[PDB]
Amino acid sequence: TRRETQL
Amino acid sequence: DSYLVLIRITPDEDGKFGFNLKGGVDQKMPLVVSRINPESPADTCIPKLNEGDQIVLINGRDISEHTHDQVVMFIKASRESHSRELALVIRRR
């Protein structure tokens, strides 16, 4: 669903 | 109330900065740091990045109308750039 992105 | 901080981060050996992003125009939420990875470049520079920081500018680019994936590509591109450095302007409560 809702986005969480590691960078 | 709130204030602006300019955080300069250079990436580590894996090309990572050490934070997590949520938000974007395609999500119905502002662009905010949802995690600081401890001891990472984001955590150790001075000033440093905090969880809950609202991203305002990325290398001077206004991002309030970009998608999550666009903001991610902008951050990844600062790596192989002029100074290898990522400049973030964030709003902090």
Residue numbers in the entry:
A (entry chain G): 1 to 7
B (entry chain A): 505 to 597
Paper passage:
The human protein tyrosine phosphatase non-receptor type 3 (PTPN3) and the protein tyrosine phosphatase non-receptor type 4 (PTPN4) compose the NT5 type of non-transmembrane PTPs. These large modular proteins feature a N-terminal FERM (Band 4.1, Ezrin, Radixin, and Moesin) domain that is responsible for the localization of these enzymes to submembranous sites in the cell, a PDZ (PSD-95/Dlg/ZO-1) domain that allows specific binding to C-terminal recognition sequences in target proteins, and a C-terminal catalytic tyrosine phosphatase domain. The PDZ domain of PTPN3 (PTPN3-PDZ) has been identified as a target of the E6 PBM of HPV16 and 18. This PDZ-PBM interaction results in the ubiquitin-mediated proteasomal degradation of PTPN3.
The instability and tendency to oligomerize of PTPN3-PDZ made this construct unsuitable for crystallogenesis. To gain in stability and protein expression yield, we extended the N-terminal extremity of PTPN3-PDZ by 15-residues with its wild-type upstream sequence (PTPN3-PDZNext in Fig. 1). To investigate the molecular determinants of the interaction of PTPN3 with the HPV16 E6 protein, we solved the crystal structure of the complex formed by PTPN3-PDZNext and HPV16E6 PBM by molecular replacement at 2.19 Å resolution. PTPN3-PDZNext adopts a typical PDZ fold, with a β-sandwich comprising five β strands and two α helices. The PBM ligand binds in a hydrophobic cleft formed by the β2-strand, the α2-helix and the “GLGF” loop. HPV16E6 PBM binds to the PDZ domain as an anti-parallel extension of the β2-strand domain in a conventional mode. There is no electron density corresponding to the N-terminal extension of PTPN3-PDZNext in the crystal, which indicates a disordered region, in agreement with the NMR results that show an unfolded extension. A clear electron density map was seen for only the last seven C-terminal residues of HPV16E6 PBM (-TRRETQLCOOH) that are inserted into the binding groove. HPV16E6 PBM binding to PTPN3-PDZ is consistent with the binding mode observed for canonical class I PDZ domains, where L0 and T−2 are involved in key interactions with the PDZ domain. The hydroxyl group of threonine at position −2 forms a hydrogen bond with the Nε2 of the conserved histidine H572 from the α2-helix of PTPN3-PDZ. The side-chain carboxyl of E−3 forms a bifurcated H-bond with the hydroxyl of the conserved S538 (S545 for PTPN4) and N524 (N531 for PTPN4) amine group.
